[PDB]
């Protein structure tokens, strides 16, 4: 489905509704029908929903790189002048919500509508037709939402123990519906280690043979140890699917959805992913992920590490000041000293960040970001290149957390612009190549 | 199979439709011509072999007809 | 204000946009304090169009000069000398912020300096000649308006400058809660604000015009632009910030312009922000708003 | 020849085509796009576009 | 905003259901956390903190003496009332140390309770379900242009 | 011969136009190519490589020799037939790796003698 | 669409008819031949 | 282990415009859901008490000035937004404002008809000078929520009428909090209700409950 | 004051245990406002009787096991947590289950005291190994909501006393969602979908009306303050 601005829908379908409201007696002749639509008399809206029903439309965003840049959807009348785009098709369209625009096309003939529903329909195109990898697979927010859902926290609230001597196990629940009643009260944590009995889900392979092997668990009860979230996660997958019981990285999510395509019809994958979306969002907001100057941490070893290579640099620079050193070698040496230190600060930085920090969780889960990126935010941005394409031996010791300096900043843009200029000519040439491949 | 319940355009599922024709392309012409066939009747002449929905669009009808194996076709 | 002050390499008597290579688009070391490196178009005009810096000044011969304060024997004078790029390669430019000593002199053992490479170097207070007039010499007006500029990569800063000149005047026009220096002086020098050219007192204040009775005995009046359509369709409406009895001084601000409040540029509103992701609505750069 | 003309070096192509007195069969899909024909791929292939559809006599009976 | 952060309005909610501070004060904008970290624009988080400072006012830090961080040094800046406007010239602005010291300051909403901690975060209540959001969320005031 | 459709995950349909799909599958990522689009374009356009590198003309052991500023490679064929010489190889190109080629190594008919881009016409 | 009939079969794009005319003006003789009968007239 | 001491709702006072309300006891995990259920309804459905359109003799539309007035008509409409009024209604009723000579116009200068009142006459409208004259009538209608200005092409109004956005919201700012009642814990929630002075926190919370009671059904 | 049109309450029956309920149309944003309060009233607010504590003969200082039965200590407790019986006592009552020999015990073998009635006799409790006996006491007291196993004082003097998590309310799972109508007579109005899975004690319709009444009178505390302001019926 897609959100279609009702004003836009009205004009697109104008000849269709004009007929409809002449069929119903709203208007006596075609001339009256045309004025009725132009002035937007309120009767037309109910009529529009009629003609637009199950009548597909093509959505395109430029530039169109692969055929997935055009996909058919089911139009839904929407208030406002914008277009509502399903969050799982952004990957294929490469659609930023920074203010991108998209074109709508109305297929007319029976054949055109058939081609839309069958060939180009959104839910029938999931995997990229290049690598076969899944595209509509969750990303960004939906990653961190599920990654948080499935993660396991040592010593959370309600953790199964299990009890000894005077008490029974204490980490057990009659059903999943019970662990919910326990979670709503302060008793249970979604990330807790508890074990539960599950009638309506399917155990894994190995634990399946040992428990039943008759056999199966269509209505049957069985017990495994998992986080409450991992239970709810597996309620999103098809009932016939085995119980994964992992914390979901992006790759782990890719593994599963790749697997659903091999073992299941497309409609199943279409709906499975829709459920991953709804869940991932709900838990992305409950995830408690934000950013702050505080949540940006800097390694304390950075100072000493910094001055450690400052001496090695000034000494090797002292060897060049002595006259014996080859000028190209001294500068070249400064690259290797500083390039190396950049890793130690990266090693030192990664070591400092608690694993639950919001900045790191984003990159860990594979939702978005790099370590190289989080290395410039805190720690050091590192060496930068001159416009000549060489490496300026002067490092940027500051990070964008502490702020750069007048000269540190003037040097960065030196290269940072040359890169933004490249991105310009990289689409101009890449498109020139694609046009030759196509022909 | 339990896929839950398809909404609108996704019904009937492609997979259950693709067993009724050689390819996705054949499925297109299959349903497409049957739709042009139905619309004529409302003015070839035959069908709606299935029970029409309330307002149902002929193309949507022809897809249901194909799902129930209510028509046969011969590729060229 | 930035349209004027723009300098572009295209046009008759200059290279075409298509032919010129990336060597001219790159920032040269001599652009410092003359042409802002952080401000250019994102399109394939990058580096061909730029804005003149804040303290930059044009020479009768057409070469840009930048203000400097000459240092002698580790002491920075009040002498301010405007130098071209040729005479800047001649000397050693001390860094704008170097610790100041009492009546003034070099405090820090050594001085930050720029050579004729331009190649940066660290030498003591001994060999310097000139020093920078202040930070943000290299920066342009719009660039100088980004709070915490030093914390943002040049990529996002460029986008930030470009988008300030992309804003539209609001009916209310509230000024920025956390600003920088320039907001005050960028609005008056723009000309969209009404300034008084003689000290005096206000005789009348109407939505239509404002009259001031000078101490000079002369009588100056200013007609207010009201709901004037602008080039691209924004609104130029002005409002008086003064009252009848008010005393006023030469160069003060009598009335606000479209994007100004009380004399400083207001390009937007101050809003209460929450950085949480919310139910998949603000996603992939999207934003959600209070119906308020 | 009109596929080559639309691609690049149009004048070079048209001049060599007119001298060689070239005849274009209009088999390729770009050619069919230009003239508004059905591209010979996907649903435009003969085997698919010539499909004939009728309801089964069994189906017509149930009506 | 001035930092290159841009986006379309994707939704506008009734003031009833929005993240709202303990005061019952709804937030005007909800910005996604994910776009911020990778774009190197983090200056937008700083001014989000300062924005809260400038809006709610603050005090020292004195007596007895002036704390270590203020020594380099805010001058006459030790106290500003609520709603006062701030200026941080680009290449000499406020500095990270000076932010934290200000981040704790100052009540009230009206009642003497404080709505933001020294981390620039607050507990928002979902205006939809009415229950709080499990973790402390960053709030503040940002300058955004149309 | 074509095999599975990456989209369907099954044998390609008979209508599929796989050239266009190939063209797009190749060009789309080109935006992400920063040893780049120039090299790719070099390959698809079949131009002689930027720095040509020689390939073995025949099978045999290799005699290496270093001149001033140059390299000489001679292949003694297992025939053993006419010796095959590669005259001036700028030392800037170094050599390919098995490690790095050394005097006495055996070479098969197609092997690349030096780091670089073999002339596709030659191969 | 206004009569709810089937959408008809497409015709010749006017731009193509224009192209033939522009090639003729270069003294390029461009004939559209059927299987036969040889030359077809755009009109 | 049924514990029944029927819920107790006791009022309070903080200021005149707002008052705290407290309800105890309640089963564990309630006040949040129960508090927000009132807040959502308070910030929306309390009726008003808002001004629909306005007519100013001199001006035919919103975008001009008035002779001698310091504020343009559009910046005056903004000010009139802050009007907090209340009306017995029903049906529309016009107010009237006329002021001459220098001075400052405020909501007190608005003469309400019989059956309406202006609860913040202290409010600044426009500042006039010797030449300034302001003659404007205002139409107060009754409703709830926020209704955007109804354009007179949709209504039956003529070229003179200036439609304005209308906020009917007696309530100003609302919050809540809960404190359990250790094992046996119950929940007691306090809600902090503030109003614009068009109604008392008591009458609004009564409105919410009354509006909230009628809704639950089965 | 208020008149509006129009809400209606309908129900789709998924199973004798389960039902779906939908209200249409609401006024935005009333979906979020009420519906979360409804999930609470049904879950925590409805009176029902459940097991509180249990003690088995032969289990005192042993950690987990029961010679003569394949079910261990933990498996039987959660086996018993599913026991649904409505008790009229208002005070804790001790039922008794005593069985021996090879066989499978069920909720029918337990002899309820007068006033407590077991609603799921076929319920499985334990499998008795050849030549074995099982003795268990069950403490059943009325309540509401979900009260985790209480050790207060704590379990204390009683040796072999096992407190158990008590599911007091009949409804074991509930959830809600929000969707929008309509054809643009009402545009973007809220529709509330509530999903109720119920224990055999009461039906979904009974648990809904129970929530309706407990919530309605609940808000009477506010309406009593004035009653002046009102809304549509
Ligand atoms: Mg974009």
mmCIF file of N, CA and C in Angstrom, chain A residues 64-65 426-439, chain D residues 2-10 29-30 34, chain F residues 19-20 22-28 30 37 41 44-45:
data_model
loop_
_atom_site.group_PDB
_atom_site.id
_atom_site.type_symbol
_atom_site.label_atom_id
_atom_site.label_comp_id
_atom_site.label_asym_id
_atom_site.label_seq_id
_atom_site.Cartn_x
_atom_site.Cartn_y
_atom_site.Cartn_z
ATOM 1 N N UNK A 64 16.414 6.413 -11.484
ATOM 2 C CA UNK A 64 16.031 5.007 -11.476
ATOM 3 C C UNK A 64 17.253 4.188 -11.874
ATOM 4 N N UNK A 65 17.804 3.454 -10.911
ATOM 5 C CA UNK A 65 19.046 2.708 -11.076
ATOM 6 C C UNK A 65 18.766 1.274 -11.514
ATOM 7 N N UNK A 426 30.909 11.158 -9.705
ATOM 8 C CA UNK A 426 30.795 9.705 -9.652
ATOM 9 C C UNK A 426 29.437 9.225 -10.148
ATOM 10 N N UNK A 427 28.392 10.039 -9.992
ATOM 11 C CA UNK A 427 27.096 9.703 -10.570
ATOM 12 C C UNK A 427 27.030 10.047 -12.053
ATOM 13 N N UNK A 428 27.747 11.090 -12.480
ATOM 14 C CA UNK A 428 27.748 11.458 -13.892
ATOM 15 C C UNK A 428 28.440 10.399 -14.739
ATOM 16 N N UNK A 429 29.555 9.852 -14.249
ATOM 17 C CA UNK A 429 30.262 8.811 -14.988
ATOM 18 C C UNK A 429 29.586 7.454 -14.831
ATOM 19 N N UNK A 430 29.160 7.115 -13.611
ATOM 20 C CA UNK A 430 28.500 5.833 -13.385
ATOM 21 C C UNK A 430 27.253 5.694 -14.248
ATOM 22 N N UNK A 431 26.495 6.782 -14.408
ATOM 23 C CA UNK A 431 25.340 6.744 -15.287
ATOM 24 C C UNK A 431 25.718 6.656 -16.749
ATOM 25 N N UNK A 432 26.848 7.259 -17.125
ATOM 26 C CA UNK A 432 27.356 7.109 -18.484
ATOM 27 C C UNK A 432 27.775 5.672 -18.766
ATOM 28 N N UNK A 433 28.297 4.972 -17.757
ATOM 29 C CA UNK A 433 28.624 3.560 -17.925
ATOM 30 C C UNK A 433 27.359 2.717 -18.026
ATOM 31 N N UNK A 434 26.394 2.953 -17.132
ATOM 32 C CA UNK A 434 25.158 2.178 -17.161
ATOM 33 C C UNK A 434 24.463 2.301 -18.509
ATOM 34 N N UNK A 435 24.508 3.489 -19.117
ATOM 35 C CA UNK A 435 23.872 3.661 -20.417
ATOM 36 C C UNK A 435 24.566 2.840 -21.497
ATOM 37 N N UNK A 436 25.876 2.629 -21.372
ATOM 38 C CA UNK A 436 26.570 1.787 -22.337
ATOM 39 C C UNK A 436 26.314 0.308 -22.070
ATOM 40 N N UNK A 437 26.324 -0.105 -20.800
ATOM 41 C CA UNK A 437 25.927 -1.470 -20.469
ATOM 42 C C UNK A 437 24.538 -1.776 -21.014
ATOM 43 N N UNK A 438 23.582 -0.882 -20.758
ATOM 44 C CA UNK A 438 22.207 -1.108 -21.195
ATOM 45 C C UNK A 438 22.148 -1.297 -22.705
ATOM 46 N N UNK A 439 22.804 -0.406 -23.452
ATOM 47 C CA UNK A 439 22.681 -0.443 -24.906
ATOM 48 C C UNK A 439 23.269 -1.724 -25.484
ATOM 49 N N UNK D 2 18.645 2.369 -36.653
ATOM 50 C CA UNK D 2 18.074 3.405 -35.800
ATOM 51 C C UNK D 2 18.358 3.154 -34.325
ATOM 52 N N UNK D 3 18.644 1.911 -33.936
ATOM 53 C CA UNK D 3 19.159 1.674 -32.591
ATOM 54 C C UNK D 3 20.532 2.308 -32.419
ATOM 55 N N UNK D 4 21.407 2.146 -33.414
ATOM 56 C CA UNK D 4 22.735 2.744 -33.339
ATOM 57 C C UNK D 4 22.662 4.264 -33.394
ATOM 58 N N UNK D 5 21.745 4.807 -34.198
ATOM 59 C CA UNK D 5 21.631 6.257 -34.319
ATOM 60 C C UNK D 5 21.257 6.892 -32.986
ATOM 61 N N UNK D 6 20.266 6.319 -32.299
ATOM 62 C CA UNK D 6 19.847 6.860 -31.012
ATOM 63 C C UNK D 6 20.933 6.742 -29.951
ATOM 64 N N UNK D 7 21.874 5.811 -30.117
ATOM 65 C CA UNK D 7 22.879 5.583 -29.084
ATOM 66 C C UNK D 7 23.900 6.714 -29.032
ATOM 67 N N UNK D 8 24.532 7.021 -30.163
ATOM 68 C CA UNK D 8 25.691 7.903 -30.142
ATOM 69 C C UNK D 8 26.205 8.072 -31.566
ATOM 70 N N UNK D 9 26.964 9.148 -31.781
ATOM 71 C CA UNK D 9 27.527 9.466 -33.095
ATOM 72 C C UNK D 9 26.457 9.375 -34.183
ATOM 73 N N UNK D 10 25.356 10.099 -33.965
ATOM 74 C CA UNK D 10 24.177 9.945 -34.814
ATOM 75 C C UNK D 10 24.487 10.239 -36.277
ATOM 76 N N UNK D 29 14.448 -4.486 -28.909
ATOM 77 C CA UNK D 29 13.427 -3.834 -28.095
ATOM 78 C C UNK D 29 13.533 -2.311 -28.123
ATOM 79 N N UNK D 30 14.741 -1.748 -28.225
ATOM 80 C CA UNK D 30 14.833 -0.295 -28.339
ATOM 81 C C UNK D 30 14.143 0.196 -29.605
ATOM 82 N N UNK D 34 10.891 2.966 -29.859
ATOM 83 C CA UNK D 34 10.854 4.208 -30.624
ATOM 84 C C UNK D 34 9.586 4.294 -31.464
ATOM 85 N N UNK F 19 19.772 -9.023 -20.015
ATOM 86 C CA UNK F 19 20.783 -8.042 -20.341
ATOM 87 C C UNK F 19 20.559 -6.764 -19.563
ATOM 88 N N UNK F 20 19.360 -6.191 -19.694
ATOM 89 C CA UNK F 20 19.039 -4.962 -18.971
ATOM 90 C C UNK F 20 19.242 -5.164 -17.475
ATOM 91 N N UNK F 22 21.209 -7.260 -16.050
ATOM 92 C CA UNK F 22 22.650 -7.292 -15.826
ATOM 93 C C UNK F 22 23.236 -5.887 -15.868
ATOM 94 N N UNK F 23 22.901 -5.122 -16.910
ATOM 95 C CA UNK F 23 23.377 -3.748 -17.008
ATOM 96 C C UNK F 23 23.101 -2.979 -15.721
ATOM 97 N N UNK F 24 21.869 -3.069 -15.220
ATOM 98 C CA UNK F 24 21.504 -2.318 -14.025
ATOM 99 C C UNK F 24 22.185 -2.883 -12.784
ATOM 100 N N UNK F 25 22.186 -4.209 -12.631
ATOM 101 C CA UNK F 25 22.855 -4.812 -11.482
ATOM 102 C C UNK F 25 24.313 -4.381 -11.401
ATOM 103 N N UNK F 26 24.945 -4.137 -12.549
ATOM 104 C CA UNK F 26 26.343 -3.729 -12.570
ATOM 105 C C UNK F 26 26.487 -2.237 -12.299
ATOM 106 N N UNK F 27 25.652 -1.412 -12.932
ATOM 107 C CA UNK F 27 25.851 0.025 -12.860
ATOM 108 C C UNK F 27 25.372 0.659 -11.574
ATOM 109 N N UNK F 28 24.306 0.123 -10.981
ATOM 110 C CA UNK F 28 23.686 0.683 -9.786
ATOM 111 C C UNK F 28 24.719 0.917 -8.687
ATOM 112 N N UNK F 30 27.727 1.345 -8.964
ATOM 113 C CA UNK F 30 28.815 2.191 -9.427
ATOM 114 C C UNK F 30 28.978 3.466 -8.624
ATOM 115 N N UNK F 37 35.676 2.936 -10.946
ATOM 116 C CA UNK F 37 34.946 3.127 -12.196
ATOM 117 C C UNK F 37 35.897 3.240 -13.383
ATOM 118 N N UNK F 41 35.437 0.701 -16.275
ATOM 119 C CA UNK F 41 35.266 1.177 -17.642
ATOM 120 C C UNK F 41 36.389 0.678 -18.541
ATOM 121 N N UNK F 44 35.365 -3.048 -19.499
ATOM 122 C CA UNK F 44 34.236 -3.212 -20.408
ATOM 123 C C UNK F 44 34.480 -2.580 -21.771
ATOM 124 N N UNK F 45 35.358 -1.580 -21.858
ATOM 125 C CA UNK F 45 35.670 -0.956 -23.136
ATOM 126 C C UNK F 45 36.837 -1.625 -23.850
#
